Subunit: 375 residues, 3 copies
Amino acid sequence: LQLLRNTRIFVSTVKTGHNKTNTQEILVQDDISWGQDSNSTDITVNEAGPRPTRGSKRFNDSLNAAEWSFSTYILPYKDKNTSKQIVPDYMLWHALSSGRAINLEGTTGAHNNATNFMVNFKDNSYHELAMLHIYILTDKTWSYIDSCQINQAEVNVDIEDIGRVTWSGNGNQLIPLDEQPFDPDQIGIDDETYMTIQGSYIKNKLTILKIKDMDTNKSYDIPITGGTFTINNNITYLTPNVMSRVTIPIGSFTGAFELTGSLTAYLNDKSLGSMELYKDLIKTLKVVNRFEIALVLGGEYDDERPAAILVAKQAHVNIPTIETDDVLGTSVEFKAIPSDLDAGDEGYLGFSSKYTRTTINNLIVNGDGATDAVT
Amino acid sequence: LQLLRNTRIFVSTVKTGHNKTNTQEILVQDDISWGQDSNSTDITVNEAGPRPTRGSKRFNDSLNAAEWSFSTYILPYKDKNTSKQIVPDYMLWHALSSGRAINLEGTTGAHNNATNFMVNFKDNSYHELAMLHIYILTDKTWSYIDSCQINQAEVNVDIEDIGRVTWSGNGNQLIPLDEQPFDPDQIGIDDETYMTIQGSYIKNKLTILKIKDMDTNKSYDIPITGGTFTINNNITYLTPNVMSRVTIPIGSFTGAFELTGSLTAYLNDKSLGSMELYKDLIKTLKVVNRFEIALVLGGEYDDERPAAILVAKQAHVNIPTIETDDVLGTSVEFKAIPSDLDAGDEGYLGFSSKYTRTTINNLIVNGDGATDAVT
Amino acid sequence: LQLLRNTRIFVSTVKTGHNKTNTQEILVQDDISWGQDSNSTDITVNEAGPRPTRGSKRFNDSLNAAEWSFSTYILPYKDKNTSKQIVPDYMLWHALSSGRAINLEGTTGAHNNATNFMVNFKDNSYHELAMLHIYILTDKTWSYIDSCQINQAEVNVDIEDIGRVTWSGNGNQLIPLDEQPFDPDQIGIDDETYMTIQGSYIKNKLTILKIKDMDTNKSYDIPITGGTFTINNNITYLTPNVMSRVTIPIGSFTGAFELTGSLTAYLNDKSLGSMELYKDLIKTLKVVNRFEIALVLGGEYDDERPAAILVAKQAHVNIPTIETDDVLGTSVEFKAIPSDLDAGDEGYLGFSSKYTRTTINNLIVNGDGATDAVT
């Protein structure tokens, strides 16, 4: 028998070669779900005779796209090889953010500094976004999915649980493989790295919102009681239709990048509170809203603390809806809107093991934690 | 913070002026739900190029109709000012039943007497039925919904709970207001009224059904084990479509009055029992059924007891369906059908704190508790 | 009052005459659900006037098909009158499998020997498959459903509960019959038969799968951890449309015979295991798969044990899907495909109180439990 407790998920770019730089291990939770489905057509005969021909041949006409959704953690840890903080699943973020292949240093989709690891969507303008091969250890069978381009990355601010993203991706085909592709233990998570990983956890009870109105330069102090965040590169797979053969999908195309999320907060009648935001949105009706929303999973402490900051420079905010709990709270929905519909300006993510108030403010102002005017 | 325990819902007829006659307080339960939604259109670009333009501007194009649904009680209490028994939410019943403004004495939609308060739908043939403004205390903020026209009033005979109606209405717009419209303490429920309110409760375990066949003059003795009742003035809101502005709904129109309900009873094989009704409906198939259905929430006692009587002079009754519980019970559905499709003859509700058998018979036969032949 | 504990369901072939040969009693569980519904059209008026005509006459225009679904057991017991083992509900299986009336001895849909009772689907080429009248004793009322042709029979291998089938059929009409059609106690289950019934139970924890690949002559050792099986004679009832009358359905027609099921098993990496089947199905993509699936509700023992064998000579098997439980298991779906779309070769069922390994192999190889080559 094979146990789910022993499952390992490895992410790689090339089929043949396999070293620690090109592929690593993902510290998946017990939410893994993969598989493939087929489109089957049933042929039935319906003729008006005295003796009907009751039968139905079934034909497999095409294959769908292989689907996988594992739920790893948010673990920004310092890299021993080069003093630049890297999350264990940086390649998944890169495949989400850019089509160019693994340019860690050069400012692109997956750019990391000594201080901060940060994810830009400026280069997210390609079809077939950074094909990645994912190897899954169903105990000891080594089954992988070929050419996985990821579809969704969802952060859920559970307000009472550790930071965890839930990836989703549409692979071309799921291939079992009799033999091992590479060496598991050497490639996957060493103990020395695992120590920093265990030290880099994010609580999500220290999340603080920084909603600001670009129209009026008004900043709101909102205590988040829960929220949701999702990135959805809408991938639709093109499958040729051959009548007498079983066809696998070819190509993946793309859709509309949707950096979207939801934010829930309690109703406070103080100044620059949640109720003031509700009144501002309900009283003034605007076709387009311009908000700067900063989701900092960690706190903004005058100390080195792990955090997974999020920013959306301009984000349309829907009308808040009053939710009647024991203590009333409003849930706002926000969808990042790129500028000029060409450049990637929806937002960017920042992961690092050490975040301070100054560095968080730096990333909020400009892309990295380099400088900030600060009066 | 703002708590749901302190919520108060005030129903008013006029905006500026505010006295005890024009508006009162509704003793709502903890099922309040109000809010507004907006229709947002997302613009995406899908062109066949080497570099796709992955972006999506989002626009707010129109506003929907504000939705509110609180669940108050059925509390017919005698009025100190005039000796006519009035429910605390009488003008809500009036807005359900008529468009003319609060003609309490004159026989219309909300007609009251010393003996009975009754709700007639004879004048329920207007568009824009009796606009009412509803003020909501989310703790202390005084946010209201402008020009609420109620949509549904549902009575649920739970058999084990106090009589409670669950209103629903589609308001034009939700306006927060910084300041108080009126004085909450003087306008809403005084202690002297509250005493009679506590004294006028309806148990719902004393309900008795009085189904009679107008075709065959056959009366059935049915012990109700549960049931449902709903009045639905279908309201669809007309919103202008302006491309470059956010439009709020103008006007409300009106649809088909639907006094509908469901009744469940155990299967008794006695004479004039539920099984006899089932056999009568299943054996004889008629295009139109004519039944007189009377739902008396209180009991018919030789004494003064509170009750919330319903009568439907002619009501089409669907075919009963056998529900296989531990003890088998049939569920019948009935929808009151008006005569001539012009006058309001679907039915009428009778609320009062003191009902006797004679008064219940009076209201079942004729409109009020004046006289009945009984020879 | 009437209790569900006393409900008895009798299955009969003829209306007037009633003996033990024509009808018996079905040992139904507490899942009985019968009833009838009607198609009602509501007429509403929507005209643009200052005074809308708010009203809605409701008309009953037609009747649907009466629906019933009881859940009896799988109880193959030896018949005292003739030494041929017969299940208590053999008429239901006969109506499922054939249109010709009760040829128990010879070769048809319900063909039984001294060894095995069997359900053959070769003769399911008729509309209006073997009309049966089912009498339901809701305590003491004796109401039946007229001309019931069954639509579905489902076997659920719960892996921890006794074998039980869940019939479903669309009867023409539900008729009360205040008087008794026949004598209940004499017709239904005597104590002597009930003893063998208590002796004939099937545990379902001894089920064995015998998937074999007709293409490659490869046999898989698969331990079932659960599964499903269903036979679905798609019955669509033709109801005439008369405007001014209530019409009951006339005729029943028939659809495509669908012997379908599902199989769930744990992932074993042994030889000829579930993992081998998964690899064979996922690595090789074929338009049509030809599998011989033999699902025995009982076990194969070198002794006389009750069992309910099932076989599908040609069964298309869909692509297995990995289910991520604590121990990973794959769920395969299989739909029997008849040969030439004219003869009934989807499969056949075998019920008997005594199966040995030799008799099970007999029924798997050829139709009867007579001989098999074995050398």
